[PDB]
């Protein structure tokens, strides 16, 4: 019920594995090239941006933010993304609860 995503500094999907379809319903092609914020609930959207602003200054540290994800079937999913940085790219582990 989780998938490994790989973003840049702004949060654009640069890589998504095959397990997204099972976890959110979207296909890798449907996620690639778009920001994760676009899929984030507007109510807790700023929070996602705040978490992403932090992983950048905290080079190497691991962070954890939980937010709502818009599934493919237009339904909200609480997603726990535990992300960190490598700056080259950002690795995210998006877990479904």
């Amino acid at each position: 019920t989780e998938f490994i995503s790989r973003h840049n500094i702004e949060g654009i999907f640069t890589f998504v594995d095959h397990r997204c379809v099972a976890t959110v319903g979207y296909q890798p092609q449907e996620l690639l090239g778009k920001n994760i914020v676009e899929f984030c609930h507007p109510e807790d959207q700023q929070l996602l941006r705040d978490s992403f602003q932090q992983v950048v200054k905290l080079k190497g540290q691991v962070l954890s933010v939980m937010f709502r994800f818009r599934s493919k079937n237009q339904e909200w999913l609480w997603m726990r993304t535990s992300s960190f940085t490598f700056i080259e790219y950002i690795i995210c582990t998006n877990t479904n609860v």
């Binding site: 490994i4 594995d17 095959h18 397990r19 582990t93």
Partner: protein, 31 residues
């Protein structure tokens, strides 16, 4: 004639899938 193509391609896919499954496990592990 072309059936031998689809057969070798279906197999090739199966191989690349098993590699993806193991590789994903490794990257999922080193976290």
């Amino acid at each position: 004639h072309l059936e031998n193509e689809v057969a070798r391609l279906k197999k090739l896919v199966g191989e690349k899938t098993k590699e993806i499954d193991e590789l994903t496990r490794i990257c999922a592990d080193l976290i």
